Nucleic acid binder design. Structure first.
Ligand SMILES: [N+]
Length: 172
DNA sequence: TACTTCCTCGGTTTCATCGTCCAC
DNA sequence: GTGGACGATGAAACCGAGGAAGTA
């Protein structure tokens, strides 16, 4: 019936946002709500379709090695292939998500950071469906400080697989 | 067939932002 | 008055259930 939303593997143009989502099918992990093997992994949103394709390629390389099926040949990812080896799978996926277009929108380049009225300072906020709160994390003089606060709250309320503005290792 | 792998996009959650409260 | 602390709102991200697309 319908033509595929993207010419690339693992890329779906979202019907409402118009963003190119990268996603991945983990055929080895176990879906526990179902019985069967298989889990959908969301890699992020990208304003550029080619960027979502590259994101899929890199995540697939981290999951299945240099001859899994790729939108582009593994020779184009040689450098990334080495860097990939130095981190967890979760660390690498968090990094891929951190570079994505949808990670942070608006004025600040950091997620959870926006500006306190017109005071020239930066508020950090974080969302928590438990308690139905948009928690306030303070006002800071630099975006990096606000982003640090957002990060700390993020690791606290999301633990592992928490995507932070700055590297998870900064907070050990 | 039946069965696995992959895509889609609607609920759900969270952010970006701006404007409002109240304890000082 | 007022200014941190937040709440309201709309935009936009997140993400799996489910159906579509390949297998074999
Ligand atoms: N967007």
């Amino acid at each position: 019936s319908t033509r595929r939303s993207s010419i690339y593997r693992g890329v779906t143009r979202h019907r409402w946002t118009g963003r190119f989502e990268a996603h991945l099918w983990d055929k080895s992990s176990w879906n526990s709500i179902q019985n069967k093997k298989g889990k959908q992994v969301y890699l992020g949103a990208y304003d550029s379709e080619e960027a979502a394709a590259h994101t899929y390629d890199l995540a697939a390389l981290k999951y299945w090695g240099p001859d899994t099926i790729l939108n582009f040949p593994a020779e184009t990812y040689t450098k990334e292939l080495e860097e990939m080896q130095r981190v967890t799978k979760e660390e690498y996926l968090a990094s891929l998500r951190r570079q994505s277009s949808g990670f942070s929108r608006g004025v600040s380049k950091y997620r959870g950071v926006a500006r306190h009225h017109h005071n020239g300072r930066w508020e950090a906020r974080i969302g928590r469906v438990f308690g139905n709160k948009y928690l306030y994390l303070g006002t800071y003089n630099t975006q990096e400080e606000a982003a640090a606060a957002y990060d700390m709250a993020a690791i606290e309320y999301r633990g592992a697989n928490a995507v932070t503005n700055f590297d998870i290792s900064n907070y050990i």
